[PDB]
Amino acid sequence: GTILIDLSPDDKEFQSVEEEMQSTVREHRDGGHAGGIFNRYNILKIQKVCNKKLWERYTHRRKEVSEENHNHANERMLFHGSPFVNAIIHKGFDERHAYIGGMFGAGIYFAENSSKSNQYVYGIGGGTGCPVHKDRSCYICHRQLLFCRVTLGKSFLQFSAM
Amino acid sequence: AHSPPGHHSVTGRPSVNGLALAEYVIYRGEQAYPEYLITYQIMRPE
Numbered sequence A: 001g002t003i004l005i006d007l008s009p010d011d012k013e014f015q016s017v018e019e020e021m022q023s024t025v026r027e028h029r030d031g032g033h034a035g036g037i038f039n040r041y042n043i044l045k046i047q048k049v050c051n052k053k054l055w056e057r058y059t060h061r062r063k064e065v066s067e068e069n070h071n072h073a074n075e076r077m078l079f080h081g082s083p084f085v086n087a088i089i090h091k092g093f094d095e096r097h098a099y100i101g102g103m104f105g106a107g108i109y110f111a112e113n114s115s116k117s118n119q120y121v122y123g124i125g126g127g128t129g130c131p132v133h134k135d136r137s138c139y140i141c142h143r144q145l146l147f148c149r150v151t152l153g154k155s156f157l158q159f160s161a162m
Numbered sequence B: 001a002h003s004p005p006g007h008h009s010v011t012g013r014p015s016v017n018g019l020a021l022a023e024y025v026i027y028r029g030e031q032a033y034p035e036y037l038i039t040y041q042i043m044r045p046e
């Protein structure tokens, strides 16, 4: 069902997505242990993800939430990093596969800081780093994140001790 | 898990590090659409 459409670097859509990536990098309290040491990325490719079935079920759910929340879906664009990106884009997100308890329980996690999502691309705490070099700060291997449309609805506010 | 009753998601908002932005959690897959796939390298600082 899924096709991937390459965006050209001159496309305004490429540029606005890249700008969100680059500008939401921060320093992390682990000094780069999980995700590596960097202030910015080299963006190699941006692809639009097109899947009619996944989109229709997104918009169907969005309408339900919105009607539960004074006609406010509370839709954001957020980063997601994990090792399951290739399954997600073909099969969609699936809460049944998301059974790992984290800081906020089991569930599907997103971040405003792209650098936060970057810490998880090779796994929890960055796992053992890239498959080729076992380096969590590898400057050579190619990484992937998703920039996702997410319906929050009424969101429970959890202040965290981080 | 499940959203807390009467809510559709959780917002995890850092309260110590004032420069860290939020994380969010959802509990249904249909509440997100993976719209862009970004392929990149991290860059070594100069």
Ligand SMILES: COc1ccc(C2(CNC(=O)c3ccc(NC(=O)c4cnc(C)o4)cc3Cl)CCOCC2)cc1
Residues within 6 Å of the ligand: A081, A082, A083, A084, A087, A088, A091, A092, A093, A094, A095, A097, A098, A099, A100, A101, A102, A103, A107, A108, A109, A110, A120, A122, A123, A124, B029
């Ligand atoms: C092994 O690497 C990781 C990395 C990050 C995570 C955490 C984030 N994980 C998720 O957001 C998450 C999202 C989607 C999925 N999977 C899918 O939606 C999915 C759909 N179809 C498949 C095959 O998977 C799984 C997880 Cl564990 C879980 C809590 O701990 C911190 C973040 C869990 C495991």
Ligand SMILES: [Zn+2]
Residues within 6 Å of the ligand: A130, A131, A132, A133, A134, A135, A138, A139, A140, A141
């Ligand atoms: Zn590597």
